[PDB]
A paper describes a structure:
Trimeric coronaviral spike glycoproteins form prominent features on viral particles that are responsible for the attachment to a receptor on the host cell and, ultimately, fusion of the viral and cellular membranes. Encoded by a single viral gene, the mature [name] comprises two subunits, S1 and S2, which mediate binding to the receptor and facilitate fusion, respectively. Here we show that the NTD of [name]-[name]-2 spike binds biliverdin with high affinity.
Details of the biliverdin binding pocket in the crystal structure refined at 1.8-Å resolution. The pocket is lined by hydrophobic residues (Ile101, Trp104, Ile119, Val126, Met177, Phe192, Phe194, Ile203, and Leu226), which form van der Waals interactions with the ligand. Biliverdin packs against His207, which projects its Nε2 atom toward pyrrolic amines, approaching three of them at ~3.6 Å. Pyrroles A and B are involved in a π-π stacking with side chain of Arg190, which is stabilized by hydrogen bonding with Asn99. We speculated that the protonation state of His207 in the biliverdin binding pocket, and indeed of the tetrapyrrole itself, may affect the interaction. The residues corresponding to Asn121 and Arg190 appear to be strictly conserved across the entire sarbecovirus subgenus. Using cryo–electron microscopy and x-ray crystallography, we mapped the tetrapyrrole interaction pocket to a deep cleft on the spike N-terminal domain (NTD).
Numbering used by the authors: 14 to 319
The structure:
């Protein structure tokens, strides 16, 4: 199954700013119109998050990137993709990421979401592949080169089937897909949010809390993860299995959760509509001390009594 891709070019690591993204609902308490202070694993506001690309730049020896490095998991991850052609397909999570230990696979293979925990012998360069057939103008799922063996499976879920749109699109990124992953006491917890966007780079500023998606009772150690991307092949990408491919444009972003005290605002319906990262700056420390999003002195004059 495994193919080590060639023709990637060198590019320095790149970064962007997380603004106030990545807040998620840290519990399932029923709330209405209250602020709640809680210490949990959060992405600090205005974090320097790492920016990864799938891109094939025009020109002679134009930059060609298909970024699927193995990355640390640390205490949990914020993951965001900015998409127009459904290039990010999922992730693998584990330790050795080989047959010596169990790993978690979460992947959209164009017809199903697949969630499996096995002793996987993952490929060094795992990827999925789409083929564009010129004569009927059809984009079809063609390659699944993620692992060469899978043994002793302890968890398997396969969603109801679908047919995902695989067309490489023109224009700006249109879909923002955000995830928080935590691995707590044997449970792999996923929070997520999908948002319409219209941008070519960076992350949008507007606030959105990620909602609980699922808790997987899988009981495995996780210290590393690796993103699964789909490449494209066609009559325009001549070469062999390693070289005859291109990347449809996509970007994704990785930040790391750490222990933080956040003040969360729940509106009339229990939606988290704003948050303060208490340790961000003196203004945020002031808000958390006052248990308030507003710090301005009032004009009642009643302070002198109490
Ligand atoms: C990681 C890759 C990934 C892909 C390729 C993806 C595609 C994708 N997700 C959708 C909905 C959705 N997708 C999911 C969840 C998932 N769907 C998945 O493929 C995976 C792996 C998860 C989560 C682990 C959910 C719950 C919805 C409904 C969310 C909504 O519409 O608000 C839809 C149909 C509605 C739309 O266009 O917004 C697409 C095309 N989403 C992703 O997160
Ligand atoms: C891919 O490269 C790695 C490291 O260079 C090597 O160990 C592995 O055997 C290669 N696999 C294939 C299929 O070429
Ligand atoms: C983000 O972190 C990297 C790694 O240390 C650093 O090189 C880069 O300058 C940082 N960017 C900003 C804007 O602080
Ligand atoms: C995706 O995975 C499911 C579950 O393993 C499998 O049944 C299905 O055939 C796969 N899709 C394709 C296009 O191979
Ligand atoms: C397009 O043609 C290819 C090659 O004949 C075929 O595999 C594919 O199923 C076709 N797609 C459609 C939608 O007919
Ligand atoms: C399968 O994995 C589980 C968890 O790692 C382990 O307890 C069990 O012994 C394994 N079975 C094998 C390796 O045959
Ligand atoms: C995970 O690793 C820790 C120490 O690194 C160990 O105590 C624990 O038993 C491991 N769990 C599994 C399921 O292998
Ligand atoms: C809250 O719920 C009501 C209906 O119960 C709905 O009309 C409203 O849009 C929701 N959101 C806000 C911010 O009020």
């Amino acid at each position: 199954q495994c193919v080590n891709l060639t023709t990637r070019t060198q590019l320095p690591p790149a970064y962007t700013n997380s603004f106030t993204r990545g807040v998620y609902y840290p519990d399932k308490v029923f709330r209405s119109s209250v602020l709640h202070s809680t210490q949990d694993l959060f992405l600090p506001f205005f974090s320097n998050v790492t920016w990864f690309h799938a891109i094939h730049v025009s020109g002679t020896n134009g930059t060609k990137r298909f970024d699927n490095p193995v990355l640390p998991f640390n205490d949990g991850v914020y993951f965001a993709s900015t998409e127009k052609s459904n290039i990010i397909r999922g992730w693998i999570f584990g330790t050795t990421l080989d047959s010596k230990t169990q790993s978690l696979l979460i992947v959209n293979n164009a017809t199903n979401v697949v969630i499996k925990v096995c002793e996987f012998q993952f490929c060094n360069d795992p990827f999925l592949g789409v083929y564009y057939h010129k004569n009927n103008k059809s984009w079809m799922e063609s390659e699944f080169r993620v692992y060469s063996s899978a043994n002793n499976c302890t968890f398997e879920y396969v969603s109801q089937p679908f047919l995902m749109d695989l067309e490489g699109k023109q224009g700006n990124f249109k879909n923002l897909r955000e995830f928080v992953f935590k691995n707590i006491d044997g449970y792999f917890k996923i929070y997520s949010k999908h948002t319409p966007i219209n941008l070519v780079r960076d992350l949008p500023q507007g606030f959105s809390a990620l909602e609980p998606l699922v808790d997987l009772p899988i009981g495995i150690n996780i210290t590393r993860f690796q993103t699964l991307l789909a490449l494209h092949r066609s009559y325009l990408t001549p070469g062999d299995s390693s070289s005859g491919w291109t990347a449809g444009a996509a970007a994704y972003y990785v930040g790391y959760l750490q222990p933080r005290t956040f003040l969360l605002k729940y509106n009339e319906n229990g939606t988290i509509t704003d948050a303060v990262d208490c340790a961000l700056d003196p203004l945020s420390e002031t808000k958390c001390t006052l248990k308030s999003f507003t710090v301005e002195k009032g004009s009642s004059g009643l302070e002198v009594l109490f």
